[PDB]
Symmetry: D2
Subunit: 563 residues, 4 copies
């Protein structure tokens, strides 16, 4: 068996990788040890970066059809039990109106809830239709790199046969116990994240719409067990920190707080997680992404979203090198750009955990309270005294602080800042962040930042600056007085053998600055240009259309391509 890219693993990072590569004309073979896409829901929060990617490759409308929209995710309830009495709520997943504006302004896309259980088969299937070969019941056993490619050994769990595959590159998308990362020799850091901690999950069915429809939320946390919506509002799953038989049904009833709504206990799983990140993600011809280089807690739902973005960063790069349009040094930028994201999210997901204890300290409970102790803490909370008033305020302070892992981390989600050989510096210094860079997105058009979203119009219809770009190619954005970029881009494109579309945004053009929001956001004059990588990151910025400005485009694209 022969291919250009062997993709070990078929979860979000592997599947996304295969879809993008097939969309780019690259032969790849994607494998999976197991029989079918992930049985469990296993993560549900889709952020905007991920929706942007689905948009670009035309799966957003489809993703939105299966997903629970934003309006359903906001009411995060802290209570004794579902049918008991609330301690309070916080506005999760950017449901506060100010948080909602900041969200809507950053992207044409929105938070939704789509269990991995559905996301996975949707992308795997698109990989197969776009051109990727997909082979389940097939296990990677190891490989051996040489100068020209790699030769991997596979074990076929249907035929029992064992065969080899010859490929030019391997992507290790094989998860939290990546054998591809082991054999590649990737160093890991940060093993220090508490004692190794695991949770248990109990799926179950039950019509709890009568306790949920009037306070629509993605989660209900009981003082700690999480009650999590799979489908509103009849498919569910209990989660909590860590064998169990059908007694699991007593737990559930207790979490629901009533035993009066018929329940149906489904599969019971555990999940372990050894929090670490890979310090480097690349070794020779091997590239790892996903859980294979960042392993962490679920706080914030950064896992699947960062994984998918890992693949979006890499695919167009493999394609340009495989086609000979780019020197293989272009692949160096994968580690330069994505490994800082990897450490960032492990540390972030872990730091969010320490926002919970203070909730208990506010209730003057201990790390673990009894049933009597819990009912005393509720009584103390309803005290009509100044000491009680101070406690209600202390509880509210603590609760509010947990928002960082429950939709408050907009900055974490969006504020990528790349520095590498695939981003051509413009000479400006790093302007930094005016507000907290974890809580708040700051749009930037400095090279290394994601292209900012604003609305233009095409045929008097709204269209995002993002929808002008992507499509697996470079796009250069300018305005009417920057007409010269059209020709300068043609010359670079012809010499370098690379597609780069130019868009001249302005009155009378194909794309119109209808609200003037592009002039407001671009940070440069009308004749300036922004060059956008296939992955939506700005790689070059000129402040005008002068000679030196124009002449630099060639140098920039040459430098990005390693040529």
């Amino acid at each position: 068996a022969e291919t250009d890219v062997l993709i070990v693993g078929a979860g979000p990072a592997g599947a996304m990788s295969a879809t993008l590569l097939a969309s780019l004309g690259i032969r790849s073979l994607m494998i999976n040890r197991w029989r079918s896409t992930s049985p469990g829901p296993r993560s549900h929060i889709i952020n905007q970066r991920t929706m942007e990617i689905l948009r670009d490759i035309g799966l957003e409308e489809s993703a939105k059809s299966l997903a629970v929209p934003k309006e359903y995710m906001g009411e995060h309830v802290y209570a004794t039990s579902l049918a008991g009495e609330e301690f309070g709520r916080i506005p999760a997943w950017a449901s506060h109106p100010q948080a909602h504006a900041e969200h809507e302004l950053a992207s044409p896309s929105r938070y939704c809830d789509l269990p991995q259980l559905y996301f996975e088969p949707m992308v795997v299937s698109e990989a197969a239709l776009r051109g990727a070969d997909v082979r389940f019941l097939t296990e990677y056993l190891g490989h051996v790199e040489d100068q020209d490619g790699v030769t991997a050994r596979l074990l076929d769990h249907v035929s029992g046969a064992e065969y080899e595959v010859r490929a030019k590159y391997i992507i290790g998308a094989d998860g939290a116990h990546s054998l591809v990362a082991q054999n590649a020799g990737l160093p890991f850091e940060g093993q220090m994240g508490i004692g190794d901690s695991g949770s248990i999950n109990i799926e179950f069915s039950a019509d709890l719409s009568s306790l949920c429809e009037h306070r629509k939320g993605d989660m209900y946390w009981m003082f700690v067990a999480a009650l999590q919506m799979i489908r509103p509002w009849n498919k569910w799953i209990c989660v909590w920190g860590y064998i169990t038989k059908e007694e699991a049904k007593k737990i559930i009833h207790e979490i629901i707080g009533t035993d009066e709504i018929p329940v149906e206990v489904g599969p019971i799983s555990t999940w372990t997680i050894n929090q670490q990140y890979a310090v480097r993600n690349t070794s020779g011809r091997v590239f790892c992404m996903g859980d294979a280089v960042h392993r962490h807690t679920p706080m914030g739902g950064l896992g699947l979203n960062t994984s998918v973005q890992d693949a979006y960063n890499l695919a167009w790069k493999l394609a340009l090198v495989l086609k000979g349009t780019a020197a293989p040094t272009l692949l160096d930028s994968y580690d330069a750009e994505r490994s800082p994201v990897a450490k960032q999210i492990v540390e972030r997901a872990f730091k969010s955990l320490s926002t919970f204890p203070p909730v208990f300290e506010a209730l003057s409970l201990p790390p673990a309270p009894t049933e009597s102790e819990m009912a005393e803490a509720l009584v103390r909370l309803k005290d009509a005294s100044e000491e009680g008033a101070k406690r209600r305020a202390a509880l509210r302070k603590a609760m509010d602080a947990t928002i960082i892992g429950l939709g408050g981390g907009h900055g974490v989600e969006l504020n990528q800042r790349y520095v590498s050989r695939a981003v051509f510096p413009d000479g400006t210094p790093d302007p930094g962040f005016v507000r907290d860079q974890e809580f708040f997105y700051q749009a930037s058009t400095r090279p290394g930042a994601h292209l900012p979203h604003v609305w233009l119009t095409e045929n008097q219809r709204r269209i995002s600056t993002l929808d002008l770009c992507g499509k697996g190619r470079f796009t250069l954005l300018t305005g009417l007085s920057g007409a010269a970029w059209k020709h300068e881009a043609e010359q670079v494109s012809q010499s370098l053998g690379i597609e780069l579309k130019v868009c001249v945004i302005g009155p009378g053009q194909e794309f119109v600055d209808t609200y003037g929001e592009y002039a407001k956001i671009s940070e440069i004059g009308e004749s300036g240009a922004l060059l956008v990588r296939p992955d939506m990151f700005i790689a070059f910025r000129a402040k005008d259309a002068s000679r030196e400005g124009l002449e630099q485009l060639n140098v920039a694209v040459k430098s990005i391509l390693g040529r």
Copy 2:
């Protein structure tokens, strides 16, 4: 004929007064010169203050059913003609996500579009059903006050008869040429409004969904004539600054910019206003409100809304005096609180006109271009030069500044600050506005400010702080540690024979601070108290439930009622 209050005029201010008064048990007689409620739509923008009043008296849902919602109002298009090319757009009626968040945060209610044509009969209907006597085709001729009441005269346009109608008070709600204001001898000021030119209005029917559906807007301005939606998207009105035959069908056809869609010309009207405000609105037993004391331009849609709020200030006050619960000096607060609003809106509505000239100047167009002159303006606008870039930016700067009269004036709408004998000062100084007080609402719970909106929950259901108050009665708001307010309020209540309802917001109460937003907004400790007048304004604020804090309750109510 005898009655407590004679209401001259049955537009928004009169109809509202009648409804509120009849709701409070007060006998009133409302009259109108004409056959019907106003034939023209006239005035369409319903701001949040007005929707809050409708909510309080229970007409909001019905208002919403007839009203075009907010999301249909946002696209304000500046162009040559409807089917021509746009110069650009501004986000009107707070459609920009950030404006929208500020909007949603300020009230439980929202902008809608509801022409006067539908609003009047709705309210006049409710007035009549709540208890008001309503009599049209009846004209106020004059009146004579004396120490115990007034004895005005009426001309009955059906029977031809002429009769007298004694009453304790007269409300002059009779419009821009109020004969009641003349007779009462109210001084006016600020006549200088630029030559007092009228506008012309052409109704017409035409299906313009294909030019509108994709950029849903409340109005489309052509370079200047306003094409304004009455019903989306088939009923319209054409408007511009100032006889006309059914030639008006030609004008429209060029304003539509295409004589292809069938047009059916309706009625043609002229409006010519004189800009002024009454320096005082009260004289003996005569109280004026609406156009009768504030007459200005349409910029901002402040007329109908301020008019209705005038009526909301006054009714509960008349009712208390008529019932003997309040001294007649309570009525002095009407002038003190509403007259500053009256000058504020005439001046504001006028100041907005001056935001349009700059649009032409950016275009380099004289106060009145020709066809060929305009055509050249659009050519100069697509000029690919550095100077053409400077011109596009100049046009955008000028357009953006027109928002102040097209939704941007949130602060103007909501930042009422009352100083009068009906607001009991709490000893704190005025905190002022951190942001521009015309553009931005700043919530405050200092006496003199409208009660801030926040979401509480009742039965785990969202309910506004506002929905706890109103209903033509004083409400006192506190928390669990302010338990003592309940008792003080009862004592005060018996003493003065005045109903005040107490709400102790907190865990396990009727109303719950479920998001903690009340603790955040109140500006005082949990055991503090806010006293809210029937019209939603705060009149007293205690910072806690200490002895002196509680003792002051009686003093405040006794001072608000003039007793």
Copy 3:
């Protein structure tokens, strides 16, 4: 007082007559003993003949906005 048609009563039959007549250019005077339109709901079912009339005189859409639709009435 003079008029072409004197309409005694302003409930559905009188109000409708007045609207139709005024639509046809006919001078009419409609009177009512009481203060208001009827306080009680009284009568709620609007059959198709009536909606057709509202449609003809252009009040159907407004009728539909205030009305509970058919699919709420079945059980």
Copy 4:
């Protein structure tokens, strides 16, 4: 369902397709809790194939049946694997 010269041309007429006539619609609604919809095979297929795999079926693409031979106890089929050859 429109019969015409071209989409933007002039209709010859329409017919009420897929039981859209109200009498046809009642007969339809009375026969089943379910309704006609339009779902291209392009989407139907991956939705069911994926559910087969999750429910317990082994699914193997790029694999071709070449023939078989039945006997008394079962059948033995020969497959050609288009990935491994």
